[model samples]
Target: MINMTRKLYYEDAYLKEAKGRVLEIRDNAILLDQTIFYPTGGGQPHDRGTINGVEVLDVYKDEEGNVWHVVKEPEKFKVGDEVELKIDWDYRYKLMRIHTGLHLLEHVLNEVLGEGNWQLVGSGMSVEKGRYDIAYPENLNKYKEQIISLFNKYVDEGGEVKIWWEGDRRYTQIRDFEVIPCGGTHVKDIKEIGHIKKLKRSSIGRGKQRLEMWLE
Candidate 1:
């Protein structure tokens, strides 16, 4: 197993120009010496970018701790080669804001509705919209506006959203919010998050309620 230092440029960067050597080639994907592309984590999508002009189709990490660069057209790269990489900043930054927003939502849900009562059923994000899921059964209309307002409040506070390493795995170190062991890139602080709009709560099934929010 080839182990390379996972240089997380995103920990201190929203925009970065990544350059690394091809460490290994496995499963038709390229492994790099270091990267800034955020893999799919915290229910956020993996970053899509380019390496030496090759389109990065998907970004995923392996069990042995290697970030895989799955390319749409693999003709531009090979093993033991050096290349420059760049992440789609517009795409990655959007995810950062939406992801932080979701965490704030989780903090809110746990405080008001009590933890363990509601579980995350689903989640997704895109430039057009962002969403979350919860297992709630009560009418949430009365609390809908309150949730939105509170979410904005936290965003306004703009506290730092730090990431840290614990044990031997990738676990984010966030304060004021429960950091549930995640291995993905994110914004350094909640202030980077913008407006939270289109907050909607609904019923999914018996004992399962869904919550979806969007960034406008």
Candidate 2:
């Protein structure tokens, strides 16, 4: 098994570029000593960009927590070579906005349901939108406008997004509003998320409700 790669993106989500040495190479997968790439995990997707000017098709983590890069031309690289890494800022920033928006959505739901009562059944994000599935018994269609208005209000109020670790667990705090154990890239402030341009609620099955949000 490979050693855990230092995840530079964790230190600063705004980071777009970095340099690292190739630690290992197997077939199409390249392992770096450190990376700014946010691998595919949690509700967020993997990062896509370039490594040493070669197009990186994907980035992911293994069972041992090591990050691997799948490049278009992997055979050109070798272990010990110094490599330059660059992430697609546009794609990553979009995900950041949506990811943070979803967190704020969580806070909004908590506000409506009374804290510690709602259950997050599932969640995920794409470059264009974010989705959260919650186990709620009531019909939320009536409060959809109110939730969007409140979420945007919080976005306008703005708040710092902070992350830290205790042992192996990571936590995210948005100002003083809420603190959640999360591992995903986020904007520095809630204002960067702007406001949700669209929010749609649908009943999936049973007592589950899915919320889909997007920016203008």
Candidate 3:
């Protein structure tokens, strides 16, 4: 935890602006001692923002847990320089909804498919949509309507998203739901996600189903 970047976003996903000091400069990527920028990992996309007025096009975390901020003007920065950090709230907000929605979606899927009927193999999220690659024996389109209806029921009722950390690991849970291990940003309440606009299903393989969801 000493060399690792102090991920400020984890403390407050709603925090859009912050200040950090540069610890190391590796080419176009700047290593900040602390940052509000959430890197590209955990199936969710990275944040878009500006660092000291320079555009931060991308952010990534290396094996050592150090976050690297890739900017267009890294040449103008130095190792010891202090920098201003700000995340695009619009883009980050969308991800928060989609990310939180996925947790609810997973719960609904389990109920519809029944226990031991499905398993989650993969998933990804973006500003436009979120997709989950599930391993099931049957096509999921047959139960799409049921899943969506149940998902919306909870969203309409509203639920709280709880996040906590145990040492270096982080966990998230929709109250009264399952606790999932994740390192991503999310909304404070389920109503912020709105009602899901669509749920699409596709057969990816013999026992694989791809479920995609969109927002209103």
Candidate 4:
């Protein structure tokens, strides 16, 4: 088992760079004493960056109390080496924007579909878009435009994105909106998300609909 790794990302999502010491190196998986990169989890993908100038191909958390990095060249690293952690700002920022957009989408979804009318069965986010798999009784295409308009309006208005922790649970809220339990990174403000370019809906299965949205 690896030692406890400090999470710099928990300190600041906007952080793009930091320093860490390699504690263990197993093949291509490197465990750092701490990290600024967020691991793959909570429906959001991992970060792309470098450690000591070596390209980070992937980032993910282990069952133990640590996040591991898969690098392009493992032979370049060794235990105890102090490494510079830098994330690709372009990729991480987009994920932040799209992730926050999904929070807004959740609020609008509950409002339009009514609080008790739907359930978010599955969800994920990427550099280009956000997704939500909702379990509803009927087709959602009829409400696509409304959802898009409202989501964009809120984006235009802008809102502060706040994050807080209750024990091990982290909660995110946009303005005074619904408090959502999420472990994904987010922009400080919703305005950074631009506006929803389009919201698409399709049937996934029995009484389940998939929602995908792109930004402008």
Candidate 5:
């Protein structure tokens, strides 16, 4: 079959529901002609909701970048079947807040440590919080207040969040702070992120510090 899924979330992250057709159905996964379900990528988890009332346990993309909605039972759907897609808005919105917070967090650290001084070793985000593992020369605890301040400052000032593509690369930026090549969902304005509920730092290993942040 042709790779024909249109990612609606890319165009509008706030779209909670969408309509599509089941283009294919494999053992445990169903492929849709179009989708609002955000697939697992760039350390962000897959979106979960339902397809025609059948629970979508998970959503993921294959090696060829085809999106698959993993249902509890695949028999409920078949090829060429019309289906209604609905993503858990509360869950997805929470992720958008935290995911965008992480991007701002990256810039906050950069502003403190100076650009290119720290490198991201790993990162992940969920509805609860966001965390990043970075290689830093010194303990990040000393800069905790500054990090939180900077992030919240941007949010309070209401910076415009812009997402665009350069060739095949996708980029997200919050005002003039910084531009990041990211594929995850995000809020339209930094103000949507609210205040920093909590910020913590710890050492995961030698020369590596982990920064964890949560939103209000």
Candidate 6:
């Protein structure tokens, strides 16, 4: 098992040093005692940075909830090596904004469309464009404008957005959402999410749908 800090990156946006002991090193990836590396999950992208002068290519979460770092050149580090990690602030911050935006989107979807009316179709936050695939198949042909309007209103309202955590095993639900267990960093409030606009949509196999969302 790998050690993990209670994810300080989520609580404090300005973390510069994350200390940990190397547990395992596989190919380019290295497992550590504790990390602030945003492992790939929940539609958010993995963090990129460096460890002991080696570039961190990608960060991933293994099956056991243990995090791993995929490095650019695999030969530099080894197991049991104590290391200090740094995350690319520019990239990580954008992802932080997008990730929080997604939670807002999830809530907006639930509000506009009833529980069964919505589903997470797909999502990705890239430098060029960020997207969310929403499974709004039925009545979408007519409700397209309505969908846009509802999402736009909330962004316009600019409600206060605050990140919530229990510090223990407990559930915190937004006004309307399908909350699942999450341990990633998020913005403090919904207003920080800004405006989101649907860029594209298409049908997938069967009744599935895809909504490509972007910041406006």
In candidate 2, stretches whose alpha carbon ends up further than 4 angstroms from where it belongs are none
Name the weakest run of 10 consecutive residues (lDDT summed) in model 5: 1-10
Q: Model 6, range 1-216, lDDT digits (tens) per residue?
A: 214423556555557558777787777767765777787776677867776667887787766666778888777666686778787876776666676666666676676677667777566677535666666657454655666677667766665444464664534333444464555566555555556655465676567766656665
* Candidate 4 local lDDT, 26-113, one digit each (tens): 8888887788888888888997887778888889988865789999998887789688888888888888899888889899988898
lDDT of each: 0.72, 0.86, 0.86, 0.86, 0.86, 0.64
TM-score of each: 0.85, 0.95, 0.96, 0.95, 0.95, 0.76
Q: Looking at model 1, which ten-residue stretch has the lowest summed lDDT?
A: 1-10
* All-Cα superposition RMSD per candidate: 2.6, 1.7, 1.2, 1.7, 1.6, 3.5
Candidate 4 local accuracy as lDDT? 0.86
Off by over 4 Å in 4: none
| Candidate 6 local distance difference test against the native | 0.64
Model 3: worst 10 consecutive residues (lDDT sum): 1-10
lDDT of 5 at 52: 77
Q: Across residues 77-116, which tens digit of lDDT does each residue of candidate 1 receive?
A: 5678677888888787777777777777888777777787
Cα-lDDT of candidate 5: 0.86
Clashes of each: 2, 0, 0, 0, 0, 9
**Residue pairs that clash (backbone atoms under 3 angstroms), model 4:** none
Model 6, TM vs. native: 0.76
Q: Give the TM-score of candidate 2.
A: 0.95
Output the lDDT of residue 58, model 5: 78
Regarding TM-score, does 2 or 6 come out ahead? Answer: 2
